[PDB]
Amino acid sequence: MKELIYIEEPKILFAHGQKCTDARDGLALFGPLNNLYGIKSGVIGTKQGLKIFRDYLDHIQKPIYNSNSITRPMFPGFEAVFDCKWESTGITFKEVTNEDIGKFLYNSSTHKRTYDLVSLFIDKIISANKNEDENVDVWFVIVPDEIYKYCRPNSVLPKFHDQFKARLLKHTIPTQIFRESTLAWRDFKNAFGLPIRDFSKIEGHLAWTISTAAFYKAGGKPWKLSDVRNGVCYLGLVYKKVEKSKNPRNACCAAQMFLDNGDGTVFKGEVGPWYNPKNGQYHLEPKEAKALLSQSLQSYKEQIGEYPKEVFIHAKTRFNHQEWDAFLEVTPKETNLVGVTISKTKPLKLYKTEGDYTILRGNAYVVNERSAFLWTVGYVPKIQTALSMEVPNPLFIEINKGEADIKQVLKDILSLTKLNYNACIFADGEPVTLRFADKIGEILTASTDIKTPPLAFKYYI
Amino acid sequence: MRNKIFISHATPDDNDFTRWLALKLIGLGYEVWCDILFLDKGVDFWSNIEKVIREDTCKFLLVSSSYSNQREGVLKELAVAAKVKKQLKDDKFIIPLAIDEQLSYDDINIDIVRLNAIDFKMSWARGLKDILEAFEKQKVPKEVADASKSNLLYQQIFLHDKSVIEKEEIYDSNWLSILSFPEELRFHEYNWMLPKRFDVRELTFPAVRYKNYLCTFAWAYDFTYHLPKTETYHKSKTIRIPTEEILSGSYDSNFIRNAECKRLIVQLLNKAFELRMKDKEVQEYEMSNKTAYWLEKGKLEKDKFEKTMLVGKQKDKNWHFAISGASKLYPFPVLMISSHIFFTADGKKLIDSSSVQHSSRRRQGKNWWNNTWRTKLLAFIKYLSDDDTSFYLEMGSEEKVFVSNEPVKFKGNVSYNIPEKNTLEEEAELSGFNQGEDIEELEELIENLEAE
């Protein structure tokens, strides 16, 4: 017989300097943080793709009615809640002919087909930003629906995503990716009860995953955390195998959240080391460890200026002193360095007395000053359902090195979880530095060459 | 004064955005009163509407849709508004919010005189702007535009009456408590006695080899059948150290370490665990590294136990309930228990292809909930329980560690209430997301990350 504890849920900063809990409700009532008005987005596709995009734009201008607003809030129009205006016309786009986009589509190899798909996408994007300034700063690119059947299912006949997102970093040109099948929920159907997908039951959510996610790459910040202390860096890292050739090289990367002068957290992602020798260690040598922390230090200097106080380096694998010995000298004396490892190899499940309603999200089981158990997956009254389809499995957060505070690091994880821009869900199953860990790892392994500067997270995913 | 702008339409039928309109306009600095917003009952809604109209109101809003036609409420409220504007001499009183898509106009009324033809079918921003200069035309005494009171209202109507509340709940975990523990651990000196060139997994009693010291609780003479030459052994060579000092982190030297003695006992408990299951004669299935333990066809009454079904049937496939166990001694000397589901073609033979296996796993799991896991686990534990107090583990000739069958029970200080959405929650989430690269595409890959 033991005891557990609960931690108060953090808040997210919204428009007019106010904080709220719900994401869709918060945006639908106040709006994004900034105020941008002039957007003329573009689309890469064909005549049928153009018609699909125009029809979906008209639909999203129209009100979107869901099944139940209690479990998931609806979409109260786009302009009325975002304060950014498009029209049916007045979109600056450069589409492609049907034959050009369909010269070779039955190719089974993803590498060769994407080497031309990405080239076609970018060549029609980087060629329009030179005519007029800040005219095409946003794109809604839609890949053909045949990609949905010949890329992900690996060329089957039932009747990948970062590759045209990574090599565009050289031009510093963002884009937003969609699909006709994602938009044409009424098309390609039959006289069946549930043709293909038929998400008539869920329609407002599909209108929320398309607006807020595309808004962030318009130079505007939708929302940030309102309770982040000044002077903290995170600097996540990802280790996995690269799929170019043998000798995986154990590629690494970085992703750090930090505050600026005032009350605004920077949502930025940096690329550091290239690689390290041999195959299985999930660790880096001291010689390349100098640059990994030095780049973060210098970036913090030139866009903040003052010394930090606590940097909570996050990781998925176990740490070691082989890198800590190099890292301790790089950091200044006034700054404390703490290494934190979070894994998913602890299959713990809690059950209550009775009921189909499951555990909450936020309670913690403290053990000692080395690790803890935190349930980031469960039930919340706002969604009136369980975030998972089965019994939730909590995380395992441990402080490999440093002192910090368990009750304080747990609050950081909960706050850092609710920083999802690609979706507008109330919460996700992993912290953003780990939720997008795979995304960043795969976007980096697509373009290993060319050292990118300390550029913002706007341009990833 | 007259600054209470009013609205009344088909609220119980279609109210997908009435709350949004109200909150937006109050954030813009206005004042309303509705039927479904505040805590009120729809038994005197029209009487309350008439009472507030005759007391204090300035403008009116109506939303036109397909559901606001077949009811007498809309027409009676329209007639009331007509009478009120006739008495007050108002040529601009009500504003129709034409939101219907399939229907343009159905019933012609004299109410068109005091309103204007506005189309809200396409967009809402244009209509909101238009109603703003509608306010600005007559110089309405608009209040301050602040979202603080808008938020304060947001935690007063939309949900937030069912949020987390202080309530104690008892949570039973997967760990297994142990009450009886061995007094001392036997560190025998074998060296040449046991030659290293033999596997240890086939040994009847638990044993872990460490250089020359065999970390085991069994007697030195217990290992007679597997090794006949164990009779020649001096008792003093069996070095005994109490396990409580190791647990307390007090016994540490060059011979053994506190941080190193803990991990050797873990393998012993796991080995005793598969010994305990093979005592029960169940079927074995190695999935990746950790084995789930399940009971096969024709071994239990009605293919079930207590009051729940374990060996069930789904279409032409036989689904079973599997349990995988482990041991962890770091927080407490306790046992890890996990659950799994495996599928059999005929109840005896297993499919060598795991693709359809995890497909059926997800298919069966998307229709289960907390009870269909917790009750099944509890029944399985009770079936594995030997006595009525706590099942035991076999280690040797006299050693008997008793493990509490009752799971470790906690006390959650925070909980929530389920007034009437106990059944509504399961029906809404039956159809999950099964798309490709747009929402989730490495679901199978994440499931089978156990590639080594």
Side-chain angles (χ1 to χ4, degrees):
Chain A
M1 205 299 288
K2 271 76 68 176
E3 293 303 310
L4 58 88
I5 210 64
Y6 182 72
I7 62 170
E8 306 300 321
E9 297 298 320
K11 307 281 285 180
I12 281 185
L13 188 153
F14 293 101
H16 303 87
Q18 302 188 6
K19 47 178 79 177
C20 195
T21 61
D22 196 289
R24 305 142 306 279
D25 292 330
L27 281 53
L29 294 174
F30 324 120
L33 305 180
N34 67 307
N35 45 359
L36 57 90
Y37 293 99
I39 300 298
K40 281 85 67 177
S41 184
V43 59
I44 313 300
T46 47
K47 183 66 174 66
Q48 60 269 16
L50 166 60
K51 291 189 287 185
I52 289 169
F53 181 85
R54 185 98 167 190
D55 294 331
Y56 203 74
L57 192 66
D58 301 339
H59 201 73
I60 62 170
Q61 300 331 306
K62 295 184 187 297
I64 305 300
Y65 182 76
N66 52 358
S67 58
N68 179 31
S69 182
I70 301 299
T71 174
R72 198 272 302 150
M74 61 79 71
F75 190 74
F78 162 73
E79 288 90 4
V81 304
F82 270 57
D83 293 28
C84 175
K85 271 87 64 178
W86 311 289
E87 282 91 3
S88 81
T89 185
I91 49 170
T92 58
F93 63 91
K94 190 176 191 294
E95 295 165 358
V96 76
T97 63
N98 269 302
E99 55 260 13
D100 195 0
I101 209 66
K103 54 171 76 67
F104 303 103
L105 293 196
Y106 300 105
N107 194 7
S108 300
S109 190
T110 175
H111 312 67
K112 268 75 72 178
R113 79 200 296 266
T114 46
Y115 214 80
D116 268 19
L117 186 67
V118 188
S119 310
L120 190 141
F121 265 107
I122 285 182
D123 194 15
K124 300 295 173 62
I125 287 169
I126 62 170
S127 313
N129 55 4
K130 290 317 288 171
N131 319 100
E132 211 267 336
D133 62 358
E134 306 307 316
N135 55 356
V136 298
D137 49 324
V138 188
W139 292 270
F140 293 101
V141 298
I142 297 89
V143 290
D145 205 6
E146 64 94 17
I147 302 297
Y148 202 45
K149 66 175 73 67
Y150 282 162
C151 171
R152 177 242 194 180
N154 196 45
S155 79
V156 305
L157 188 153
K159 189 68 176 177
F160 62 94
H161 170 272
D162 56 359
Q163 287 174 355
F164 63 95
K165 186 55 67 70
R167 76 174 77 187
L168 56 85
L169 277 296
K170 58 182 181 292
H171 295 285
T172 74
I173 305 298
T175 182
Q176 173 55 49
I177 307 157
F178 286 135
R179 280 195 175 278
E180 305 95 1
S181 64
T182 308
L183 310 192
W185 68 295
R186 289 277 179 83
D187 201 0
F188 320 105
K189 72 165 289 295
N190 212 348
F192 286 159
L194 191 69
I196 48 169
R197 297 285 75 78
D198 194 24
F199 293 100
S200 176
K201 65 178 72 66
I202 208 64
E203 197 69 32
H205 160 266
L206 277 297
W208 275 97
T209 187
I210 58 161
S211 178
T212 308
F215 165 76
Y216 162 66
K217 62 188 66 67
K221 294 332 181 183
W223 45 257
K224 291 300 294 184
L225 283 178
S226 66
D227 291 328
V228 166
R229 48 185 163 279
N230 170 38
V232 288
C233 199
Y234 286 103
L235 183 63
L237 56 87
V238 186
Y239 301 153
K240 78 168 187 290
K241 177 253 191 182
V242 308
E243 293 83 3
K244 278 181 70 174
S245 66
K246 332 291 169 64
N247 197 343
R249 306 316 294 124
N250 302 114
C252 173
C253 66
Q256 71 275 18
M257 295 298 103
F258 49 88
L259 197 75
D260 218 349
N261 194 4
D263 291 314
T265 304
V266 182
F267 174 72
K268 187 269 183 181
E270 184 178 1
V271 178
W274 297 268
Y275 63 90
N276 52 358
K278 68 181 178 67
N279 283 0
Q281 187 58 21
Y282 314 131
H283 285 131
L284 74 164
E285 51 264 7
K287 64 90 176 179
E288 66 168 349
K290 305 295 191 294
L292 188 153
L293 191 43
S294 82
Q295 67 180 0
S296 81
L297 188 143
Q298 63 84 30
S299 69
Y300 204 61
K301 299 289 94 176
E302 279 91 6
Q303 60 257 13
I304 295 89
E306 69 267 16
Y307 279 134
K309 45 173 211 173
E310 279 298 5
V311 188
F312 301 93
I313 297 89
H314 286 45
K316 63 155 63 151
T317 190
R318 75 279 191 190
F319 267 112
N320 56 347
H321 270 316
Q322 184 196 155
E323 57 186 279
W324 208 248
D325 63 358
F327 278 156
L328 60 85
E329 71 95 17
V330 186
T331 179
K333 45 188 62 56
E334 192 260 309
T335 64
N336 189 359
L337 205 72
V338 165
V340 185
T341 293
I342 305 166
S343 182
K344 205 69 169 63
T345 179
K346 317 273 190 314
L348 156 64
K349 322 211 207 199
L350 279 191
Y351 312 86
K352 56 188 66 180
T353 66
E354 294 294 328
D356 265 2
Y357 63 93
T358 188
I359 194 168
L360 277 162
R361 166 191 146 92
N363 46 25
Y365 183 59
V366 287
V367 182
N368 203 356
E369 204 71 26
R370 196 180 190 276
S371 49
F373 285 160
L374 183 63
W375 290 267
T376 70
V377 177
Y379 168 87
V380 298
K382 283 296 289 182
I383 201 167
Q384 292 288 93
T385 196
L387 273 298
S388 66
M389 73 291 291
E390 279 183 349
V391 183
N393 189 359
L395 311 174
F396 182 76
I397 307 148
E398 70 95 20
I399 303 181
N400 208 284
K401 291 156 264 289
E403 197 268 328
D405 193 2
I406 301 299
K407 283 185 179 180
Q408 187 65 222
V409 73
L410 280 184
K411 293 169 67 177
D412 291 346
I413 301 299
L414 203 56
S415 308
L416 191 149
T417 45
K418 56 178 72 174
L419 275 181
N420 218 6
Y421 277 3
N422 200 84
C424 199
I425 306 169
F426 181 45
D428 51 356
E430 287 90 358
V432 63
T433 189
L434 293 186
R435 165 42 181 61
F436 277 104
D438 57 358
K439 245 65 184 182
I440 300 301
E442 59 191 334
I443 203 168
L444 269 296
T445 192
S447 178
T448 301
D449 45 355
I450 297 89
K451 198 262 176 186
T452 66
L455 71 83
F457 194 90
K458 183 179 179 181
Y459 279 81
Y460 293 101
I461 67 170
Chain B
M1 61 76 58
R2 320 286 97 82
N3 48 6
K4 308 246 191 180
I5 190 167
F6 195 71
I7 177 168
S8 277
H9 68 240
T11 59
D13 292 28
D14 189 358
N15 63 7
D16 209 11
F17 63 91
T18 75
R19 279 84 166 83
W20 165 72
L21 294 174
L23 289 155
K24 193 71 66 178
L25 62 85
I26 68 154
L28 260 68
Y30 297 114
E31 193 151 342
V32 297
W33 211 272
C34 183
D35 292 331
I36 46 159
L37 271 170
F38 324 107
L39 278 75
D40 293 299
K41 304 73 191 173
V43 290
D44 51 351
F45 63 92
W46 181 65
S47 71
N48 291 319
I49 285 162
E50 300 295 320
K51 187 268 183 181
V52 298
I53 280 181
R54 64 201 61 270
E55 272 186 351
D56 281 317
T57 187
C58 68
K59 299 289 94 176
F60 185 82
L61 277 296
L62 188 153
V63 184
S64 300
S65 177
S66 50
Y67 289 8
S68 68
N69 189 179
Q70 50 93 28
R71 301 188 326 282
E72 51 92 21
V74 169
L75 60 94
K76 64 170 165 59
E77 288 170 350
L78 271 177
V80 160
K83 179 249 179 180
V84 166
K85 64 83 181 173
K86 174 272 301 173
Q87 208 263 324
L88 268 299
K89 210 260 180 183
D90 208 348
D91 47 350
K92 285 91 176 176
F93 204 49
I94 77 167
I95 297 169
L97 306 199
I99 69 165
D100 210 354
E101 190 75 33
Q102 69 275 15
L103 168 73
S104 300
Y105 201 73
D106 44 357
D107 281 334
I108 298 99
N109 200 358
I110 204 64
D111 303 322
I112 297 169
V113 178
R114 88 196 68 107
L115 57 88
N116 45 314
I118 46 179
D119 182 74
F120 290 175
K121 294 192 85 162
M122 186 66 204
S123 166
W124 273 345
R126 285 286 290 108
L128 188 153
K129 180 67 174 66
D130 291 331
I131 191 167
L132 270 294
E133 69 267 35
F135 293 104
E136 295 173 354
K137 272 298 209 306
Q138 293 82 17
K139 314 192 320 312
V140 59
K142 186 182 81 67
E143 282 86 4
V144 297
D146 191 22
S148 303
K149 61 163 183 304
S150 85
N151 266 309
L152 294 174
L153 269 295
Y154 174 53
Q155 293 83 18
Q156 274 290 111
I157 296 90
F158 195 74
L159 317 179
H160 302 165
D161 53 355
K162 41 180 83 73
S163 68
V164 298
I165 202 166
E166 195 274 331
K167 186 195 290 184
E168 301 312 295
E169 284 188 353
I170 304 301
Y171 280 47
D172 43 8
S173 72
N174 290 318
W175 292 272
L176 317 175
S177 289
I178 301 177
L179 301 177
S180 80
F181 63 100
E183 293 180 1
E184 306 163 336
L185 196 156
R186 291 172 177 79
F187 293 99
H188 319 268
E189 296 171 352
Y190 294 104
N191 279 280
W192 77 276
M193 173 56 257
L194 276 296
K196 201 255 184 182
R197 311 308 149 91
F198 305 90
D199 196 3
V200 70
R201 290 173 298 185
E202 294 89 3
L203 197 55
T204 300
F205 303 119
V208 175
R209 31 193 169 178
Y210 160 67
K211 299 175 181 175
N212 51 357
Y213 273 87
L214 265 295
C215 180
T216 182
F217 292 104
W219 199 250
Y221 281 10
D222 274 347
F223 301 99
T224 301
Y225 172 60
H226 300 271
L227 186 59
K229 50 176 73 67
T230 52
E231 205 170 5
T232 49
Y233 183 61
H234 195 288
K235 206 254 184 180
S236 84
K237 310 168 68 140
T238 299
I239 302 299
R240 41 200 60 81
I241 295 91
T243 56
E244 58 264 17
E245 282 172 17
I246 314 161
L247 292 175
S248 301
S250 175
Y251 182 76
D252 205 324
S253 187
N254 198 12
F255 162 60
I256 209 72
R257 281 81 65 193
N258 274 124
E260 204 263 328
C261 197
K262 291 185 278 191
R263 69 178 178 87
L264 316 173
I265 316 171
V266 169
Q267 194 169 80
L268 284 180
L269 291 192
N270 278 9
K271 183 171 175 181
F273 198 73
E274 70 267 13
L275 294 163
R276 165 73 191 166
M277 52 85 78
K278 72 169 64 65
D279 189 359
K280 298 276 303 184
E281 188 65 27
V282 298
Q283 187 175 2
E284 161 65 29
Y285 181 76
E286 316 209 339
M287 53 83 74
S288 179
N289 53 354
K290 55 191 291 291
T291 301
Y293 293 163
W294 62 271
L295 188 153
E296 62 97 20
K297 298 279 183 180
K299 285 195 164 175
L300 199 56
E301 91 291 343
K302 315 181 310 303
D303 272 327
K304 67 176 294 300
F305 182 76
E306 193 72 26
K307 294 178 289 296
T308 186
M309 182 179 72
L310 189 153
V311 188
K313 184 79 154 64
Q314 190 63 23
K315 300 302 150 45
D316 51 347
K317 197 66 175 175
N318 303 265
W319 66 274
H320 314 262
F321 195 79
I323 299 299
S324 55
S327 188
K328 202 65 175 72
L329 309 175
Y330 178 47
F332 301 101
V334 298
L335 270 294
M336 294 299 291
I337 301 299
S338 301
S339 65
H340 289 278
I341 299 302
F342 292 147
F343 288 83
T344 54
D346 52 354
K348 296 185 179 181
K349 196 175 181 180
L350 294 158
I351 298 183
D352 301 337
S353 165
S354 296
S355 71
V356 295
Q357 271 285 350
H358 63 86
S359 84
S360 313
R361 274 201 30 201
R362 309 164 303 168
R363 172 58 198 78
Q364 214 79 43
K366 85 169 191 292
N367 295 115
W368 291 353
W369 277 270
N370 312 144
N371 293 324
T372 61
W373 284 112
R374 180 196 66 90
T375 316
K376 269 79 160 175
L377 183 63
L378 260 67
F380 182 76
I381 301 299
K382 300 289 94 175
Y383 161 69
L384 267 296
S385 305
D386 300 294
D387 60 353
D388 50 348
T389 48
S390 70
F391 78 106
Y392 69 97
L393 297 178
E394 285 195 340
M395 283 73 74
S397 54
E398 69 270 16
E399 281 80 21
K400 201 173 179 189
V401 170
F402 284 83
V403 192
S404 178
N405 52 7
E406 286 181 350
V408 176
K409 301 181 187 294
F410 294 92
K411 184 185 177 182
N413 302 336
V414 286
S415 169
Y416 51 100
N417 193 3
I418 309 289
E420 65 180 2
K421 277 74 69 177
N422 57 5
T423 301
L424 294 174
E425 63 196 78
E426 61 86 20
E427 61 89 30
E429 213 177 4
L430 301 153
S431 179
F433 278 149
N434 48 4
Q435 289 184 352
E437 61 171 17
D438 291 317
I439 290 176
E440 49 184 0
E441 61 275 13
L442 281 72
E443 183 71 33
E444 296 173 352
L445 296 192
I446 287 299
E447 279 312 304
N448 51 42
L449 281 170
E450 62 184 1
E452 185 176 2

